[PDB]
């Protein structure tokens, strides 16, 4: 993957402003609500019984944070995402058997969450750069399948 100077600016500039606990919690909660089969993977998180319980489940909150903070590892070094995400690829593919399509769905949700928080500042160009990043991260996660 090649990153442009502008794409790097849009990514690193938004990353500094991102509340990872808040966006992370919301992104994972929306995943479980909008695509309910994803709940099977998180059965051990306790009460996932309604949107409100999912939203106020502490393990959901905490895991969502950890998902989003691991995007910082990508932001840190954008030209080395493939190798940075190799262990997490093994985890998701060999242990959990999460179908790659679900990586795409969480990426799409993250983008909606970012949009709702940053509104006006979430320009078409900033969206495109962020879409590219979740796509690259999803592809890095799916590499142990190939």
């Amino acid at each position: 993957v090649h990153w442009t100077a502008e794409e790097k600016q849009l990514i690193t500039g938004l990353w500094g402003k991102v509340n990872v606990a808040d966006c992370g919690a919301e992104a994972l909660a929306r995943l479980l609500i909008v695509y309910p089969w994803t709940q099977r993977f998180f059965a051990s998180f306790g009460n996932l019984s309604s949107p409100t319980a999912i939203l106020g489940n502490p393990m959901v909150r905490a895991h969502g944070k950890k998902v989003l903070t691991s995007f910082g590892d990508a932001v840190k070094n954008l030209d080395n995402i493939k190798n940075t995400f190799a262990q997490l690829s093994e985890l998701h593919c060999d242990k959990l058997h999460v179908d790659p399509e679900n990586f795409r769905l969480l990426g799409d949700i993250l983008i909606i969450v970012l949009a709702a928080h940053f509104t006006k500042d979430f320009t078409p160009e900033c969206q495109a750069a962020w879409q590219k990043l979740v796509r690259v991260v999803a592809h890095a996660l799916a590499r142990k399948y190939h």
Partner: protein, 141 residues
């Protein structure tokens, strides 16, 4: 398809969108063209520069059809029947492109009306865009 709760939720979000449907139409297309450049191939005869009259005119029509489907939520295949022939028979739009546009629309809603797009409304609106997607790719044979 759509529960009574879903229909309430979709009517709910679209009421807030209201007078802005046209602008949101244009904004959705602009984001789609930028974020998924492969969609540009279906509009070779368009001016796709930012804020072009062609995008605004087309955006208005896309939004208008969505509003019409909302107003006829109980029978959307009927409300959009002419549009299914155009998209499925004539243009042969790859189904995947309806997911791109549905996603850009949800992004536009979130930007302008974040408090209205609760997780529950999100889930309903996604189902709705999926329902519209399937109708417009239907009559393929």
């Amino acid at each position: 398809v759509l529960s009574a709760a879903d229909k309430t939720n979709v009517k709910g979000v679209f009421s807030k969108i209201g007078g802005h449907a046209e602008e949101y139409g244009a904004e959705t297309l602009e984001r789609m063209f930028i974020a998924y450049p492969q969609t540009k191939t279906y509009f070779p005869h368009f001016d796709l520069s930012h804020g072009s009259a062609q995008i605004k005119a087309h955006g208005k029509k896309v939004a208008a059809a969505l509003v019409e489907a909302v107003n006829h939520v109980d029978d959307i295949a009927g409300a959009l029947s002419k549009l299914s022939d155009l998209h499925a028979q004539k243009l042969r739009v790859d189904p995947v492109n309806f997911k791109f546009l549905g996603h850009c629309f949800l992004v536009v809603v979130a930007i302008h009306h974040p408090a209205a797009l609760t997780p529950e409304v999100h889930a309903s609106l996604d189902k709705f865009m999926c329902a519209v997607g399937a109708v417009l790719t239907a009559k393929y044979r």
